[model samples]
Target: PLDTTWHRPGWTIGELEAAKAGRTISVVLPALNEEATIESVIDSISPLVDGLVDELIVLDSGSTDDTEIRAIASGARVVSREQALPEVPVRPGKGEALWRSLAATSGDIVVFIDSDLINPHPLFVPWLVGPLLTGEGIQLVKSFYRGGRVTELVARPLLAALRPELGCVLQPLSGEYAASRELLTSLPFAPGYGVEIGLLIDTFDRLGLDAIAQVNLGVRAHRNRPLDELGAMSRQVIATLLSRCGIPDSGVGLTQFLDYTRHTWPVSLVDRPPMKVMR
Candidate 1:
């Protein structure tokens, strides 16, 4: 089981404990306006702290609601996006929050979970961190689930066409993943929706495919946004891929239509430099 190379399920607590040895683990949930599901998500994983996790942090990205309050009451050290890296100007993006989370945490292994998960399982954290703790040479573990509209319709086909070697990856854009701090700090984080794909490609570039692993989480339920919203997400994913492939300037912004009018929203092509270099 320790030598397993591909995606599989069922990682027991005892196995993870033995494999973890004395290493510290951190769980990061980058949140915005996710007050509805934040507490439940934190509750699901709180059982593993001390026993399995060393730190649990909610990296709040300027929540206008009670996301921060609930997270604190539920037992997570809530750090704001502005507070984590005070010197840097604030940017609005999931990746932006994630980039700052690296500075806010101190752990040998970092596990990232989205705050908007519905009916999250305690096993999700262990399942992601298991391979990294046990499997030989595994540096990154991605959580795979049943259905993702963006993954199937946009990311999968794009990878198949561009980075065919990575085409086998199930959910390239999954928000839930575990990576060694050494590896994460060494790679640049794309400061937008492209963040997931950006990290995946960079990891593939920095380390061979063998270093990457996956775990089947059965099913994951999160807020499903409207179809029009997916347009921006699709653009960001595409821009990230193309920029890495060959086109250095894939796109600066995306133009979308509403009714008969067109609007161009700026898309960030820049990536936050590797955290290791910054410090």
Candidate 2:
């Protein structure tokens, strides 16, 4: 495997047990119109709060449904995304919500979980946050599973090309990760589909490759977007990746050609043709 060694100074579970006497861990779920799955996600992950995480904060971004109410009923602190960042005009995206949530809550370590997952593995919180508890410095654990076909095919290749070191990560866009409050406050979050990838790149750029880790969390079920929606998402992700890599805004179109026969097309083509063609 790829070096996979822990970078932080060695510390045993005994040290973590001793340190747990005083320190607190906080988990944040950035939800936006996820009323259908928010309650169950909260219920499944809440048991970890008492001993594993001290607080669970659900940062709802103007949910039109009972997302906030359900979250509150499940023993989580519900805060509006706009209220969290009153000065910085709220953008309708998970990254914006997460950034604001980081500022609103205080904890030695912060674990972020998507609010839409179903029957999520309980070990997710601990698996992601365990490194930090055991003295790992600014760990960025990416969760994965045995049959995680999506991560293996889509996320992994993209990370490899854009950020080779990070490519080894199993699920770069899994929407589940943990990091120190110190690290969270320091990095800037790109508003939408860019959040997870942006965080990974920023973390690697700032802390070096050794500070990250990937954990196996088995399967996660969430609402998958329609093919058309996935296309839009892929476009946003590509734009974010290019921008982060310092690719200048050339008039050149973002679309790329990929086929032998005129009839054949690339497996993934997400962006629409630009209105004005450039020579």
Candidate 3:
């Protein structure tokens, strides 16, 4: 028989409500071109939105589709990444979008949900934010499920080699989690798929093991990416982990190039090169 006595404890709805009497809660969804699934994601989480969270913020990163419009229609505060971080141009990555969202909203506790989820359960909101609302010192709560195929294939294997102790975690990159504002601002955000793993390592390193908790969210439905896409995600995750662990170098190399075009015409019989401009 298993030792079921050491079960994890979480707050009930009543407890969460009482604790949040004067406190503010914000729910943020970092979205891209998720028009096909954004409405359902908002609708399924509507009840929790009205009662638990004081604000619903959708941080969009240049979605060409109707994702931003639909999210606004669902009564969410929609802001583009550029608008939130005007001083610093928004980068093309999920982590960059999340970092900007953190700066855009003010809340005692923030719950982050991926916009791609289908039929997201109500418990998704309460269960994630419950711990922080009820008590202090707790910094992060990671959500996991039993049926996440991507978690099994991609996240677990990566954690095994990079951070074996965290390998047992069911879903390190589930993209559903809650954290306090103090911690969010202090930690550096990885501007890519490495955000989730980077967050876990940073939180644990800063707050110790007792401050982190994993909550069971039953199950979540989200579209799975193809193998090629997963490969890219894996690279980003590894890059983040290795960077934080002080590995000194990565197995993969990232190269960035800036291209400029020059338009020039003969002027005053002087041969001069045209000035280069960025697009």
Candidate 4:
């Protein structure tokens, strides 16, 4: 496979406005109970509010916290997942918010970002949309960060077995990405942590390798998720990769023995197909 890796472009405010002239671009911050971090994430892209993107929205996945007000104050129009697509019944998980936001915000170019990010770069927004806005033959742009245990352990190994061609791409499970509405809507959305993996494989099958690229986003520093949570995430990622390869899941939760006691934690997790395609 060809090395199609790229880095974040150092674009000025004018470049963003010019690139987004006629077309509509929507940046989606899908969050649930992330009130404290939501404000800072919106602030990072706040400067690009007016001229850069046609719409900037925070997709609230039933956030029990003050995420709605915080995102609103930070200059993003907030919409809850339940109220997003009233026509279709609401589905749970971040991927549901990601897929539904296309109609919710009516964005031609959708940039899906993580609201939990700390110290997010302003350029992440513009750089993600650069290829779609400027470059030819590129439909998807997945962000590549410094580290991830799941990508290293679960995602990569499964790809090697099923999709050896995609192994060269730096980060398959990275949550942040920017893709054309045409490319994303045509594919299925695997809810939860498996969204990125399902998206990458489906994109590769649909559009070929040349249509995708990974951007260097430096180090993405965030709070450490609990082991139990990560275990659940790993299960979904594994199931996604397996199902895509015509393999069946064991239907058993991931189990880990307690370090202190003889107890164990069983994490049952998985992802459904794209919300739109299901209908």
Query: Which has the greatest lDDT?
Result: 1
- The clash count for each model shown is 0, 0, 0, 1
Q: How good is model 4 by TM-score?
A: 0.89
Alpha-carbon lDDT of model 2:
0.68
Candidate 1 lDDT at 230 equals 84
- Of the candidates numbered 2 and 3, which has the greater TM-score value? 3
lDDT of each: 0.87, 0.68, 0.72, 0.78
Per-residue lDDT of candidate 1, residues 94-135 (tens digit) = 889998999999999999999999989888988888888877
Q: Candidate 1, which segments miss by more than 4 Å at Cα? A: 1-10
Q: Which stretches of candidate 3 lie over 4 Å from their true place?
A: 1-12, 147-150, 250-279
Candidate whose TM-score is highest? 1
Global lDDT of model 3: 0.72
Error of 1 at 242 (Å): 0.9
Residue 162 lDDT in candidate 4: 86
Q: By TM-score, how accurate is candidate 3?
A: 0.82
Please report how far candidate 2 places residue 78 from its true position, in Å: 0.8
TM for every model, in the order presented, reads 0.94, 0.80, 0.82, 0.89
Cα-based lDDT at residue 105, candidate 4? 72
Better-scoring candidate (lDDT), 3 or 4: 4
- Cα lDDT for residue 158, model 2? 72
Q: Across residues 233-260, which tens digit of lDDT does each residue of candidate 4 receive?
A: 8887887778888887786766666626
Q: After superposition, how far is residue 177 of candidate 1 from its true place, in Å?
A: 0.6
